[model samples]
Target chain A: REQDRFLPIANVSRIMKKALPANAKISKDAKETMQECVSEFISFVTGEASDKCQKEKRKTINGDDLLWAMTTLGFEDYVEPLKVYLQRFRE
Target chain B: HSLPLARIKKIMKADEDVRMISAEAPVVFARACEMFILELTLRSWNHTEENKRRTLQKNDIAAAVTRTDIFDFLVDIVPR
Candidate 1:
């Protein structure tokens, strides 16, 4: 999973960077808070949110949801290819 | 009688759209396929889960096949 390739620190950082506006103010406390939120979102998505939801028990993700999330985060460049990839699953 | 009449009407309209009757079915079928793929992609996205995981599920793939517009169209058009 390319999504999981940046797991642990890298994954957390990616989420944090996405959460904050590019031109928004940054402080040590704000950075720390963002890091915590990033960790939680990663856990929720990866199935580590609850003891029962761990790894193998988690639901699978599709390119659609990923592309949608990326679009929400201002990453439109990857949407079309992701759409085509999801379409391939049909064929 | 009504059905056969409707078929003749469709043929007449298609003839006006394209000069060759032989070329009409293939062109329409290809366009339908393209539309089907597009619709399938959209519907698959609609039913997809939000969780980020390693692998795609069979149900997800099944959803695409079942929801593709072209698949449904072909099923309706083909003879029993």
Candidate 2:
């Protein structure tokens, strides 16, 4: 139920499992926990970015707003990777 | 407790407008300060580990403050 609020649980589980060693098993509870955490994080960052967009009187959130929000939320380590992804997507 | 209550009280008294503080105030502030220290240390350590470094350096603390919104108050102290 909670998993439906964000990315599909199946995809989350698949991505998480890929990060682990081959043959590493993930329990149902662990998968659920990861889903919840990832969903919460997405909500938090997007919510903060939305607020920034509103403050700037913009109808839409852009890459700059999301970047600012990510830094504000203590995800500076992700900024460069995300910027590259955004550039490629826009191109 | 882990914090020096006497020092906490003394620091609180430094405010010219403040004449006294409740007994529980220092205890509460001490706990808050302890939590603040633990939080900053943990965030900085995480940054260090992310960079594949074993030592937590001053830059790690600076980076933590730079990234966190709640730490904006310390921006003047932390170099960019």
Candidate 3:
């Protein structure tokens, strides 16, 4: 099921907005740029994890696999918090 | 809630070649997004700091993009 938009620009704008202060403003350029960045990022991570799942002789891609992908793909910082998040998610 | 899991799932399935996805895939992606947002913001803050200003501008984000090699896919968009 292929689609055009990956992540919403509105959400990206808001997400980017929240990280900054009330006084700070983002350019439409930033929003435009980020829309692609985040989408591609999610795509990259998912594809990597999906491949790992495929190699395992048939299964769905789980959170742990995604975290493993992130760690191996140079996103080591994303692991710890996400473990707690995964723990809570399963709870 | 930063990045809706519904949308994240949609986006994941957006790729046709991607066959199977676990329920947890979107959740992990959502959490990954939060961290990405945090890291980008902090890196942008560095540029904001160098400019002696508290408010972050697009240029700061651009600088962050340029500073981070992984963001190479997004270089042209930021340079604008």
Candidate 4:
């Protein structure tokens, strides 16, 4: 089973305009780039590959698949942003 | 068709003298490549300095990144 993209879902929706904490650090450009990457990811998954793979009963990759997406897209710039966000999970 | 596009391009752009270990493999190889990149992305995102500093169990920077929302996004985007 795969997990839902809640953070990004919130990011793209109007329900939560300010999801990041006040102390978090995410530059305006980086945020926009993250959006772009997410859009591209959506396109890649839902595009032709999905159709071709569906016929074979292999709809998509599991958690393992995400590894390739990030490396392929050169997503290193947002590492710091992610680190900052994860801080909220701590007690 | 899911191989690391950037890495693939980099390899393609490489000199003829350079050799590939699994370039001859079928398209499935591309899928594997892409999966690897996405996994790395997930592992590096959503990590905190506290996680690294505290050295919690199974809760280091790497673990935090492994379970990030971006990772979930990548996973969700894939067709089931």
Q: Tell me how each candidate scores on DockQ against the true complex.
A: 0.01, 0.02, 0.54, 0.03
Compute the lDDT for candidate 2.
Answer: 0.54
Tens-place lDDT digits, model 2, residues B15-78: 3334334454444434433334445556765676788775555566668778877666555555
What RMSD, rounded to one decimal, does every model reach?
Answer: 24.4, 18.6, 3.2, 16.8
> Over the stretch A1-91, how does candidate 1's per-residue lDDT look in tens digits?
2222212333323333343335333233323333332222222222211222223353333333334443544335445754664465456
Ranking by DockQ: 3, 4, 2, 1
Index of the highest-lDDT prediction: 3
Could you tell me every candidate's TM-score relative to the true structure? Answer: 0.24, 0.51, 0.82, 0.26
lDDT of 1 by residue, B1-80 (tens): 10122232233233222222222222322222233233433343343443332222333334544554323322322212
What digit string (tens of lDDT, one per residue) describes model 4 on residues B3-77? 333443343223232223222222322343333334443342334344443111222223533355545445432
Look at candidate 1 and tell me the lDDT of residue B53.
26
lDDT of 1 at B38: 34
Best by TM-score: 3
Tens-place lDDT digits, model 2, residues A1-91: 6333433556555654444445445456544544443434444555676676567666554456656776887767666765665455456
Q: What is the lDDT of residue B16 in candidate 1?
A: 22
Tens digits of per-residue lDDT for model 3 on A1-91? Answer: 2335657777777887677778776667566666666777787787788787778875677778889988877788779988989899888
Q: What is the lDDT of residue A26 in candidate 2?
A: 49
Candidate 2 chain A minimal-lDDT segment of 10 residues: A34-43
Alpha carbon deviation, residue B3, candidate 3 (Å): 1.8
Q: Which 10-residue window in model 1 chain B sums to the lowest lDDT? A: B1-10
Each candidate's interface RMSD: 23.6, 19.3, 2.3, 15.0
The lDDT of model 4 is: 0.35
